Design a protein around this ligand. Sequence first.
Ligand SMILES: [Cl-]
Ligand SMILES: [Cl-]
Ligand SMILES: [Cl-]
Lengths: 167, 156
Amino acid sequence: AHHHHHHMAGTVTESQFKDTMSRFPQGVTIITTNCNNELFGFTASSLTSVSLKPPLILFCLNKNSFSINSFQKSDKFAVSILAENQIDISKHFAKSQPNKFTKIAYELGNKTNCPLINGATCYIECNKYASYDAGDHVIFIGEVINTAIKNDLKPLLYFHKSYTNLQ
Amino acid sequence: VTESQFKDTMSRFPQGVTIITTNCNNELFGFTASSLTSVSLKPPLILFCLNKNSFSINSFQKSDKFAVSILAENQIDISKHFAKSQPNKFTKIAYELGNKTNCPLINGATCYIECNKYASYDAGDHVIFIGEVINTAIKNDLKPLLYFHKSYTNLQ
Ligand SMILES: [Cl-]
Ligand SMILES: [Cl-]
Ligand SMILES: [Cl-]
């Protein structure tokens, strides 16, 4: 059967990890900031609600991303939850390149001045609340200071390493 | 920001549904969680968040390991059960205690994950638990349970 034991090392490979975690479905967001009047953003599915009182959310960003320094230095960010018809937006922001916003329809949020992506199902503005190293990423926790639900369009899903939709 | 605007807006982000468990001195604990996310590839880390007001919180704080079962679309009843606050949640549940952690993995789940606790952090009215993945298994090819707009639903 089994007995009382302590820490075991395990045998999991990276591919096993990726394949397994791909089977947790998630929405798709563009997360942005404005650092010394320069715009940065990336495609993020690691969003989650964290706390109600105070109202907190988090996301995770790779230490090796072009974006990381800006989020580290900036005290604010914004989140746009993508609709089903926004795959092109999702792919564009997932591509590492400077000046991601030249051809993109966006508005600056009222409370953070961070870009919100037109067409998104809804918008979230945050002040940065805390920040933690975690393996090869950093976890950013935001306090939600503004929200707007923009439309009833259905959300983009990411599942099994691919884009899909709700029923 | 009102509680309603926060909760209703965040409900727009769809998530899967998991049962997260630990075994603390041979006593089994678990709850239904949609906060799961991947955190790191090297090392392989995931996190979840648990309310400080949950019955389970002490057991997760004290136990240095946990497990996660990703629920299939036919497991709404299991999701509701583990969301219900009460002792002895496993009495009539089909599980298997994980090989690496002895934490319960829920039969019929699409995927099993075992973690050692890597870190944890206070975050407003929750605790963020980070786990290093030390075992995984893909158990079936069923489609995942989704939770969206405060309702259970399905992929297309
Ligand atoms: Cl919450
Ligand atoms: Cl990752
Ligand atoms: Cl049940």
